[PDB]
Structure 1
Amino acid sequence: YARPEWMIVTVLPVPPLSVRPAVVMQGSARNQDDLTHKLADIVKINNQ
């Protein structure tokens, strides 16, 4: 159920859209969640 090597994560699970939805706040402007901003930095560094 829990191996020691499984705590050293090599793949990062991306949360679904139901966990980090984008809101509409006083007009047509999709404000992304903090996780979406943080997952953006994860992919950018991982691609780099």
Structure 2
Amino acid sequence: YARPEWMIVTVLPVPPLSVRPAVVMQGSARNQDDLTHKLADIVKINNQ
């Protein structure tokens, strides 16, 4: 159930869209959740 090597993050899990949904504010503007905002940086840095 637990291994030391599993303490190192080698692959990051992405929460479902329901856990971090995109709210709509000031019209049709899809306001992304705080997690989606950081996930965007994660994938950007990952690609970089």
What TM-score, normalized to structure 1?
A: 0.93
What RMSD in Å do the two structures reach over aligned CA positions? Answer: 0.7
Count of aligned pairs between the two proteins = 48
Report the alpha carbon displacement of residue 8 of structure 1 after superposing the two structures with TM. Answer: 0.6
- Identity score, percent: 100
Unaligned runs of 5+ in 2: none
What TM-score, normalized to structure 2?
A: 0.93
Q: 4+ runs of 1 displaced by more than 3 Å?
A: none
More strand by share: 2
Separation in structure 2 between the aligned mates of residue 11 and residue 17 of structure 1, nearest angstrom: 18
Report the alpha carbon displacement of residue 26 of structure 1 after superposing the two structures with TM. Answer: 3.0
Q: Deviations over 1:1-48 (max 9, x none)?
A: 000000111000001001000111131110000100100000000100
Separation in structure 1 between the aligned mates of residue 42 and residue 28 of structure 2, nearest angstrom: 27
Unaligned runs of 5+ in 1: none
Separation in structure 1 between the aligned mates of residue 40 and residue 13 of structure 2, nearest angstrom: 13
